[PDB]
Design an enzyme around this catalytic site. Structure first.
Site, PDB file in Angstrom:
ATOM      1  N   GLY D  69       5.182  28.558  15.603  1.00  0.00           N
ATOM      2  CA  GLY D  69       6.500  29.145  15.742  1.00  0.00           C
ATOM      3  C   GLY D  69       7.564  28.389  14.975  1.00  0.00           C
ATOM      4  N   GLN D  70       7.134  27.514  14.071  1.00  0.00           N
ATOM      5  CA  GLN D  70       8.066  26.738  13.269  1.00  0.00           C
ATOM      6  C   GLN D  70       8.759  27.631  12.244  1.00  0.00           C
ATOM      7  N   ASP D  71       9.921  27.167  11.776  1.00  0.00           N
ATOM      8  CA  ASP D  71      10.665  27.916  10.768  1.00  0.00           C
ATOM      9  C   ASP D  71       9.873  28.037   9.473  1.00  0.00           C
ATOM     10  N   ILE D  73       6.684  27.996   9.309  1.00  0.00           N
ATOM     11  CA  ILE D  73       5.487  28.777   9.603  1.00  0.00           C
ATOM     12  C   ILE D  73       5.794  30.169  10.134  1.00  0.00           C
ATOM     13  N   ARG D  74       7.037  30.440  10.533  1.00  0.00           N
ATOM     14  CA  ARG D  74       7.391  31.780  10.996  1.00  0.00           C
ATOM     15  C   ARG D  74       7.204  32.838   9.922  1.00  0.00           C
TER      16      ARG D  74
END
Ligand SMILES: Nc1nc2c(ncn2[C@@H]2O[C@H](COP(=O)(O)OP(=O)(O)OP(=O)(O)O)[C@@H](O)[C@H]2O)c(=O)[nH]1
Ligand SMILES: [Mg+2]
Lengths: 142, 200, 10, 180
Positions: D69-71, D73-74
């Site tokens: 849910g990282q920026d 990785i989003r």
């Protein structure tokens, strides 16, 4: 609401008629003849909108038989066209490859579908599948 | 609400519920049922827009509550199809007929101007009808379409020509009356037989 | 003829 | 042609199915995937990239592709959307501030024409504290009832307890598999 909706052929023959306003038979016939003459005497670049008798006389036929609507000047003009397109799609789905010949033979079915779709000139079935399912269930009753 | 105004106050309490329903419908832009031409529940959206326009037309709380919904609809709706154009026209009419903000009025005027330049006969008729309805309201902003109104009189559409003539007649003021007199006389002289009497 | 043709051609 | 081999394979179980692991960071997606595959709550490092694993249940191997849910990785969730049949979204009911972000991410994922045949799989993660919402409040906040043409189901699962994972897996299998 839609004051009256009638399906008239290119030659002038009427394949459908549904008026939501109580009018005299002679007056209704005269109004239908005037609407047919206006539609028959209108080009393809007239926007499919006519302001006749203070009514949004919208004519939009996708085939040789044309369709006409009469609604008051209180709603958007595109809404009538969208409703007409939705009704045409629903009728085509219910019948299957709907043509001019099938409309005459299926006049009772077309009237029943119109009654189950719009009552009193107002939209009664927003969805397209629910109305078709209800029509099929009513037909299967016998 | 339209029959009598006594239920307007009672029916105006459900404004937040209607706004929430409209927001939920706009968020769900895809649906197997009622989704035609990329617009889900176009009839429901049109009914919501009509209720918003007729609800709180003379009150600030009703307009303020539906101001965010109108702003979202005016920018979150695509008018590529007929359903989208009808929804945009209904939203513009509701904004004009209600005590909306200056930004909402400017957006409605811009949408009407953009639809006026559309080559579609139905789109042109809708734009002319919206301009005629928004004659008294935003009259100064309607003066920027004087050239469009004049050109609509020469359009090859009977409905379009009638709408242009009506817009020109309703846009006549105490300063453009003298200038518009020559245009009106020219239109009456070279008008259709059914419009010559109306022009006169 | 023109009557047997589909109204929408779908 | 003959389909005798296919019938023989399907008589003893041939369907596998698919699944996806998406959601906000620290939303229990990795913990949910570990519970589905192994069955224990093991602490893991942040998912900078993605986690690939397979879970076999009811004779169907529902592989789960964990997505962070990282920026950074989003926006990479679209890469894992290709060749994917299912998608499971883990909501953070204990993160009110991140609830809006998770709802926006779910709406963006569901607002893509490529991801249309995948039914909604909303898992109420962090369902172990009193601050966690129920199976209806979280869905109402995320607007799961307005996802037309999408089979979305809201289920509450606690990573520490593991309850509700079996119900969610059964619901996903019923939505995907329509056989006896
Ligand atoms: N201890 C505990 N943690 C929970 C619970 N429910 C959800 N979690 C969260 O699950 C996370 C487990 O971390 P990960 O294995 O990396 O899985 P993740 O939540 O998807 O985090 P990322 O992989 O970085 O996206 C923890 O950080 C918690 O925030 C719970 O009931 N107990
Ligand atoms: Mg993880």
């Amino acid at each position: 609401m839609i004051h009256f909706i009638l399906l008239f052929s290119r030659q002038g023959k009427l394949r459908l008629q549904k008026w939501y306003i109580t009018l005299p038979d002679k007056e209704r016939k005269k109004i239908t003849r005037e609407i047919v003459q206006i539609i028959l005497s209108r080009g393809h670049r007239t926007s499919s909108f006519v302001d006749w008798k203070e009514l949004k006389l919208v004519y939009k036929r996708y085939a040789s038989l044309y369709f006409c609507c009469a609604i008051e000047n209180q709603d958007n003009e595109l809404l009538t066209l969208e409703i007409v397109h939705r009704y045409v799609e629903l009728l085509d789905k219910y019948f299957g490859n709907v043509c001019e010949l099938d409309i005459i033979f299926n006049f009772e079915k077309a009237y029943f579908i119109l009654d189950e779709f719009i009552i009193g000139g107002e939209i009664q079935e927003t969805s397209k599948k629910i109305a078709v399912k209800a029509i099929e269930d009513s037909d299967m009753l016998q | 609400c339209e029959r009598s105004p006594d239920m307007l106050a009672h029916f105006r309490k459900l404004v937040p519920q209607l706004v929430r329903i409209l927001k939920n419908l706009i968020m769900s832009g895809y649906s197997p049922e009622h989704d035609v031409s990329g617009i889900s529940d176009p009839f429901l959206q049109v009914r919501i827009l009509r209720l918003l326009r007729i609800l709180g037309r003379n009150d600030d709380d009703s307009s303020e509550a539906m101001n965010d919904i109108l702003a979202q609809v005016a920018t979150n709706t695509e008018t590529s199809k007929n359903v989208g154009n009808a929804i945009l026209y209904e939203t513009v009419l509701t904004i004009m007929d209600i005590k909306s903000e200056s930004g909402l009025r400017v957006l409605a005027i811009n949408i009407l101007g953009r639809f006026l330049l559309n080559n579609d006969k139905n789109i042109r008729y809708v734009a002319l009808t919206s301009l005629l309805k928004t004659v008294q309201t935003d009259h100064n902003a309607v003066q920027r379409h004087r050239s469009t109104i004049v050109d609509c009189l020469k359009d090859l559409d009977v409905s379009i020509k009638r709408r242009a003539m009506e817009l020109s007649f309703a846009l006549v003021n105490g300063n453009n009356i003298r200038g518009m007199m020559k245009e009106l006389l020219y239109f009456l002289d070279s008008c259709e037989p059914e419009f010559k009497a109306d022009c006169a | 003829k023109g009557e047997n043709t589909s109204l929408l051609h779908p | 042609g003959n389909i005798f081999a296919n019938l023989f394979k399907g008589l003893f179980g041939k369907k596998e199915m698919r699944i996806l692991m998406v959601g906000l960071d620290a939303a229990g997606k990795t913990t949910i995937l570990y519970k589905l595959k192994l069955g224990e709550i093991v602490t893991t490092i942040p998912t900078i990239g993605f986690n690939v694993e397979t879970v076999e249940y009811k004779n169907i191997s529902f592989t789960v592709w964990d997505v962070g849910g990282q920026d950074k990785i989003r926006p990479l969730w679209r890469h894992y959307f290709q060749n994917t049949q299912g998608l499971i979204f883990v909501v953070d009911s204990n993160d009110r501030e991140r609830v809006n972000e998770a709802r926006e991410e779910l709406m963006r994922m569901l607002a893509e024409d490529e991801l249309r045949d995948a039914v909604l799989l909303v898992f109420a993660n962090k369902q172990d504290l009193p601050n966690a919402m129920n199976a209806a409040e979280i869905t109402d906040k995320l607007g799961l009832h307005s996802l037309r043409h999408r089979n979305w189901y809201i289920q509450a699962t606690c990573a520490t307890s593991g309850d509700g994972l079996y119900e969610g897996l059964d619901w996903l299998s019923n939505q995907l598999r329509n056989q006896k």
